[PDB]
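Worked example (supplementary).
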Amino acid sequence: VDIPREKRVVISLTYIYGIGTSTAQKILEEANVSADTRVKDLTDDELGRIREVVDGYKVEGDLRRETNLNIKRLMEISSYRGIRHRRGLPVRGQKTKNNARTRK
Amino acid sequence: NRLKEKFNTEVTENLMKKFNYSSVMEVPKIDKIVVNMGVGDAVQNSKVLDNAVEELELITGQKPLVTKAKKSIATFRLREGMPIGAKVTLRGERMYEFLDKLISVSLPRVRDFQGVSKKAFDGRGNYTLGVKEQLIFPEIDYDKVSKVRGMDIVIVTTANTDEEARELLANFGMP
Amino acid sequence: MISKIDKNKVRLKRHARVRTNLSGTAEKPRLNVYRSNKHIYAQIIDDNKGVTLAQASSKDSDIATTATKVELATKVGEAIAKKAADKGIKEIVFDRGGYLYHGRVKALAEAARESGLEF
Amino acid sequence: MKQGIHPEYHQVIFLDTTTNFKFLSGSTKTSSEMMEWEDGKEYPVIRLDISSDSHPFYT
RNA sequence: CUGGGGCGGUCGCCUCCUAAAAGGUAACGGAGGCGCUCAAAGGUUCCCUCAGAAUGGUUGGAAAUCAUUCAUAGAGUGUAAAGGCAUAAGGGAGCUUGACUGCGAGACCUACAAGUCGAGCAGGGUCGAAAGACGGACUUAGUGAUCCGGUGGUUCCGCAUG
RNA sequence: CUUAUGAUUUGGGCUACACACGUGCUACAAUGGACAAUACAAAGGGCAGCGAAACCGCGAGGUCAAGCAAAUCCCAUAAAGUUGUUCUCAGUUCGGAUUGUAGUCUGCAACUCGACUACAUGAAGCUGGAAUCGCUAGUAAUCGUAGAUCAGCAUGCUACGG
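After joint prediction of all chains, the assembly is encoded as:
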């Protein structure tokens, strides 16, 4: 979709939302790509065969639409898993004393 | 202007047989829909007003009128000017294109049981439905809009009392 | 509910405001305008005596067609001048009623300027 | 009617699989694939909705 | 100046009240303002009508905003108050510079100096289809003589002449 | 103190937080990171407990028998290393905190309130100021393995070697 060039494709598809080290296996399954594909890859006939396998995935941005509403559903029921989002609470039953900083 | 005939059906099939009007002219008729968004005090929202004037064009395809203040009320930061509103009066076929769209997509996306009211009138024939912006952009999904908001849709008819405006709102409306 | 105004009463207020520095004195009379929805009416009034001098109308039998409703107004402006060429063909004061100087009120006045009247 | 200030709108055929209540409009300037002749001969880009499939009130 | 004088206060204009139904009318009587502001807040042609009240409506402060119905002006009118005003003098919009030059019959005011208002007449414009309207702001305060000095004009003078 | 300050139950809490000091873990990398191969230990445990080799699962793991109450059977292939291919010096293939998807396993039962792995997401963090602590040889430093508690559960503790 908006991937960068001049790097290897096993790390290049990671740059979008929704892919981490599945391009090593799952995108490598459907497409006949290799590991050493730089910017000089000629991935335009290979752009189509990755477009068929990425169309099944929720990855490119649209997963964050469903991820946002899952929190919005969770706070609307007002669950203890959901109040901890709206209140800076670590949510997954953690100790909210001194070393609980990344939620503030 | 396809489903305008829904009104032209109900003027003579239900309304002549309900109140027994003596002429076809004095059936209650809807004249305007104003979709006045509200205030949204713009000490910062003057940039969100540029979003709020962009969202309301997507709901109804007419540019809003950015209505400014009138008084100099304290405990509120505003003067003459300071544009703190937006509205679109929907007169013609864009009304029915908006009405025969919204009354099918207002109750479902709000996730309410009954949904609007049994009564919201003012004793004259005006409804003033209240919206917390759970319905709009049904075509492009939640991708590029920024801030949650709340609309207000007013239905102004030529009804005379409450019970004749209940009759027009009983045509694919849910009271 | 909502109350629909009539277009005559607002027109009358506007006309009243217009017609306070606008008068005919029989050396420079006044033609006014009354268009309704179908017919245009023109009438030379001398405002001093309260006595008219001429009268023309789109529903009169001399000029009654279904042309445009604008070309009907051109026929009436042709009519009011050729009856004011019988007497008092001098300058007059155009009175627009409460209407704009546009369309049918303009074509009533364009026709009267190119048919002898000197306003 | 004024040119310049209006956005786009068209006869958006609301292509819903339950009876296709196509009396809607908006800004769905997307791919026109199948236009029903009884409905708005335009883009069918309203692809799925809960509009008139199961009302909560008239259930 | 002064209900002795001093001390305090005051000193010029504007608006009321006192003021006795014309005008005018005092007190160290009662109230307040002014020593500006505006290139649109001027001109002109067009449209437009408010406050408030209920009522009921995603913001909901009671009260922003929206709609309906009542609303005589209770709003607004650069600025004090008094007269005004919906002819709108109030509120928008478009063009513009008359926030012109030479004058002015007549009138008001008044001890004098001053102060005010003017139809109209040319000249040359602006706006408006046109009639027309324009010699600054709704009106009434926003200043200070003469002498001297500066500056720019000027068919005037300029000492025997230039 | 003695119809309770003793009892009996499931349900909370001991796990709460704008914070403040102790003690540790993992790091902020190219004397590293990711993937393939290939070595070398010691100590200790195993009373229905340890459970192999096979399979079936991406994996955490499930199904039975193989052995055995143990110098032999099992936990158990230690890891760092070494060898090769890689990225190229960026908050990049550095790490992995935090949130939704697996529902794996233990246990009447994992919401308060567990333990991992699975695809996602990827935050602070570029070696740290004043100060302050440990340590004199198999010691500082690092690397992994055991056990006691224990149905399940340690970044702690206690022992172990490289």
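Two points are worth noting when inspecting this output. The longest helix of chain A spans residues 62-76. Chains A and C do not touch (no CB pair under 8 Å).
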